Amino acid sequence: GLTPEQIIAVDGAHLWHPYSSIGRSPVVAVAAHGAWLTLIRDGQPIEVLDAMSSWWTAIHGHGHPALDQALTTQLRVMNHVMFGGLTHEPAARLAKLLVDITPAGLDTVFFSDSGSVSVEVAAKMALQYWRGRGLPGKRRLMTWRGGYHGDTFLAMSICDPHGGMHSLWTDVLAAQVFAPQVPRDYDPAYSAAFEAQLAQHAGELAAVVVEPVVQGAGGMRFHDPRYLHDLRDICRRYEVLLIFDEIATGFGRTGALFAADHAGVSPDIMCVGKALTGGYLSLAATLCTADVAHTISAGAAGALMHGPTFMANPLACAVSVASVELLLGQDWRTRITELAAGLTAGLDTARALPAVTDVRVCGAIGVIECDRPVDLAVATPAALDRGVWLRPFRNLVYAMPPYICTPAEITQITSAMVEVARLV
Amino acid sequence: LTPEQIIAVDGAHLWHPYSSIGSPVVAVAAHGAWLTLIRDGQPIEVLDAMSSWWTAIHGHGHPALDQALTTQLRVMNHVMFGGLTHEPAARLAKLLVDITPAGLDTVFFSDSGSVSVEVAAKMALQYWRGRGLPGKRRLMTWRGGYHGDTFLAMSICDPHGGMHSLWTDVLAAQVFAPQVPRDYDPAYSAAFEAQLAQHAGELAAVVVEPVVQGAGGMRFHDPRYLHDLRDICRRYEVLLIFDEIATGFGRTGALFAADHAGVSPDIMCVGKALTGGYLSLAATLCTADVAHTISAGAAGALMHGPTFMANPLACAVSVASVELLLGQDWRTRITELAAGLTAGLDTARALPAVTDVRVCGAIGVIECDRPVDLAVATPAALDRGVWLRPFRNLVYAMPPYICTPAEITQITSAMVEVARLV
Numbered sequence A: 001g002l003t004p005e006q007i008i009a010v011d012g013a014h015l016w017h018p019y020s021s022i023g024r025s026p027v028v029a030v031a032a033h034g035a036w037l038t039l040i041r042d043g044q045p046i047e048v049l050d051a052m053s054s055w056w057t058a059i060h061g062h063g064h065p066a067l068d069q070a071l072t073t074q075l076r077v078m079n080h081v082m083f084g085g086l087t088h089e090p091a092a093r094l095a096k097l098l099v100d101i102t103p104a105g106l107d108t109v110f111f112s113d114s115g116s117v118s119v120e121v122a123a124k125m126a127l128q129y130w131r132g133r134g135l136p137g138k139r140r141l142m143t144w145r146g147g148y149h150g151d152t153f154l155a156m157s158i159c160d161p162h163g164g165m166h167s168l169w170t171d172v173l174a175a176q177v178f179a180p181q182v183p184r185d186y187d188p189a190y191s192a193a194f195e196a197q198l199a200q201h202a203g204e205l206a207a208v209v210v211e212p213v214v215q216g217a218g219g220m221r222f223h224d225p226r227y228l229h230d231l232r233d234i235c236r237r238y239e240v241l242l243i244f245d246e247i248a249t250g251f252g253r254t255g256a257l258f259a260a261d262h263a264g265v266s267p268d269i270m271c272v273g274k275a276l277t278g279g280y281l282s283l284a285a286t287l288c289t290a291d292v293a294h295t296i297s298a299g300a301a302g303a304l305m306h307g308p309t310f311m312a313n314p315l316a317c318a319v320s321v322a323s324v325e326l327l328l329g330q331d332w333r334t335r336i337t338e339l340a341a342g343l344t345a346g347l348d349t350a351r352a353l354p355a356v357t358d359v360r361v362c363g364a365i366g367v368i369e370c371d372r373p374v375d376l377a378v379a380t381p382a383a384l385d386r387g388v389w390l391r392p393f394r395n396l397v398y399a400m401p402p403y404i405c406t407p408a409e410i411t412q413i414t415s416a417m418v419e420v421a422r423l424v
Numbered sequence B: 001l002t003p004e005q006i007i008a009v010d011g012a013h014l015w016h017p018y019s020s021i022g023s024p025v026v027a028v029a030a031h032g033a034w035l036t037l038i039r040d041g042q043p044i045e046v047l048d049a050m051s052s053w054w055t056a057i058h059g060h061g062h063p064a065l066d067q068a069l070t071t072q073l074r075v076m077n078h079v080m081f082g083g084l085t086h087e088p089a090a091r092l093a094k095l096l097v098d099i100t101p102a103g104l105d106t107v108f109f110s111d112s113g114s115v116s117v118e119v120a121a122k123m124a125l126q127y128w129r130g131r132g133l134p135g136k137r138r139l140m141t142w143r144g145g146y147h148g149d150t151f152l153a154m155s156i157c158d159p160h161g162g163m164h165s166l167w168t169d170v171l172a173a174q175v176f177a178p179q180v181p182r183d184y185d186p187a188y189s190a191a192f193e194a195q196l197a198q199h200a201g202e203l204a205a206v207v208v209e210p211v212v213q214g215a216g217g218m219r220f221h222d223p224r225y226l227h228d229l230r231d232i233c234r235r236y237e238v239l240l241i242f243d244e245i246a247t248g249f250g251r252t253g254a255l256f257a258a259d260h261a262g263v264s265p266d267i268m269c270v271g272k273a274l275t276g277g278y279l280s281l282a283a284t285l286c287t288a289d290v291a292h293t294i295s296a297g298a299a300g301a302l303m304h305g306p307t308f309m310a311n312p313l314a315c316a317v318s319v320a321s322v323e324l325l326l327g328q329d330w331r332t333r334i335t336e337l338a339a340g341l342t343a344g345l346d347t348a349r350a351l352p353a354v355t356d357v358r359v360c361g362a363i364g365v366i367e368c369d370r371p372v373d374l375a376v377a378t379p380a381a382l383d384r385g386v387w388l389r390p391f392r393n394l395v396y397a398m399p400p401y402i403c404t405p406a407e408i409t410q411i412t413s414a415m416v417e418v419a420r421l422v
């Protein structure tokens, strides 16, 4: 065991954090329950709201009794078995649910252990698909700027070149095709231009890959769902697969079960993750259509050569089943609409603040965009004083709260955001 | 769902590893070294001779691991590792730093082995960029290797005999030395050095599996090669990366296979047995020098950060698994396992279809003169109360460390009968 001081000491010497350095200070978390984290501030444990849902994951809050129970129930019977030559109930139950609730036509599921991996699996499916059609020249990807798809090297290649620091990786990453930043408001001219650019690359392109409706890590930007309708149409006419990365948008977050639903379109391949397990454990999945699966499987190449060791882990699958069932068993649509309303009401006053350039809400996502970078040394202690854990990045103050947050809690979260923006 | 229903859903909707779409056996329980599987409508108990792909070193449902998991679950399932830290991450980092080859002082947690390999590569590239030598961006390895299924990991898989052979045209083009031989031959090392010499200015790192190459063909090599690799890399200023995702945590008879050579790499990857086979977790360790050079470079930071980085549940069960291993005389245990495998597999050498029998720690291998047909091997093993998963021309086992001598004997007996049927 360790005290918070010893935790800090070990951490400082030995632990890498996300996109950070060694030797160039994290706060100790000692507990988490419901929408609340218990953190150590100046030696004292304080409870603060998890306004980020621990990076989109904790949709039902932490330690939800239904999810805890599902995990302990599975733990008593079978922790894990290899998915090579064996199958099990949690995998089957989850696959059936996912095929049932995702956009029409996605009826095969490949489980993996993280979002980045599921994106690489998606790309491999796309590339292998065209090889299966005797068109191995179709091996590039196309996306629009502003996106994020994970940190592995292939995933990096489709991340926004700036957000992704591609300047530090020149000569290393695959060279992919980038369309301009998709605008917020629908402009048919944008889709016409996208089509024209894609058309000249069509014989070289395996797939278009995008985050539908909301671009998360790349800048919390929203775009009209009609663009997705356009992409589906362009992809169909030029024979390029469409891949939706719903790793952040999945499971109700944008006000629809999957953001694709806002557009009423179905991609050829889809990735889900983050909230899949209700934020308990790492699990991801890549779904594809019957046509994709068979075309791969009928290829001379044959099998899809991917197989994570912990593929379809019974514990992760079991909690995900429970997380998904819990979401489906409640009036989730009304819950998100309410959250969206609370965020809109709460954030409204920031729009008139001097440093604020935009205020936007989409389902259970609220964003204040400022006219300059947000100083974390100022923002964090402010938010903590107000009982809220916020993680601004760049010029963005934002939140994606647990679905279980009460009106009072949403008011607390937004009040802390508005204050952070005021201090900007 | 009943077993028949599971099979129905699975055939319709589930993609399995390394396979096409369009039958698996239903597993319904796991306890200790035993799986309960359903065969012809009836539950049967079979030994998990594969430790569930090399993960379940303490067996399934071990009370110490189960309780570590439920204890952590009561307190905190997960928080984002951005701006926060926690006891499970710190306890595990401290353990890993203490038990791995000397000099490995920093720990980057990720969710899978393939990711940890990409993290290792990113460390190496960023390191040289930090030194002002961005031309050092290629990797070198020897043939016969396997490092995962993500695109960077694939680039260092064996390019002809390896599982990723069909992708070679789209992968980064790396530098390959010939297959490392089993017995030590100074001429092999000299040739490796001569090859590396000509690429030194473009090489970020040498990356290899130490002592045992797993998925590439369960081949063993003399630890002395690792000593030469360390020497060569030091002299030519190329980083040395060991992928111990398969070999770690006692599997080869030493705590880490590098220990057989007394060598420390600059960067090291671990996974699989890290969590005792409960949950997915991996880690990439590097020296203080590598970390600082990255941190002081133009980037100012290592540009990677998985959503579930340092997951408290996975870290907590890993802590318990490592402590359980260290808290017993694991070396004697593995030596006893190895003796049992050796004695049990000895009669396979005489069989007509068997080309080699070899054992290294708790790994036992019968190499056959043809690819093993699973449709024949699987039922033959199940009839003998053992779950075996051959691949290529290999019938092999990596049993849980908790297997008794009788259980090892049952495992090796089934392997021999499988080899007899080939």
Ligand SMILES: *Cc1c(COP(=O)(O)O)cnc(C)c1O
Residues within 6 Å of the ligand: A114, A115, A116, A117, A119, A148, A149, A150, A151, A211, A216, A217, A245, A246, A247, A248, A273, A274, B305, B306, B307, B308
């Ligand atoms: C977070 C994210 C990923 C990467 O998921 P990891 O589990 O961190 O590898 C990929 N795509 C999107 C849209 C994401 O938000």
Ligand SMILES: *Cc1c(COP(=O)(O)O)cnc(C)c1O
Residues within 6 Å of the ligand: A307, A308, A309, A310, B112, B113, B114, B115, B117, B146, B147, B148, B149, B209, B214, B215, B243, B244, B245, B246, B271, B272
């Ligand atoms: C299994 C393995 C990996 C990859 O582990 P995954 O969890 O399947 O990504 C990498 N390297 C070696 C040596 C391995 O044995």
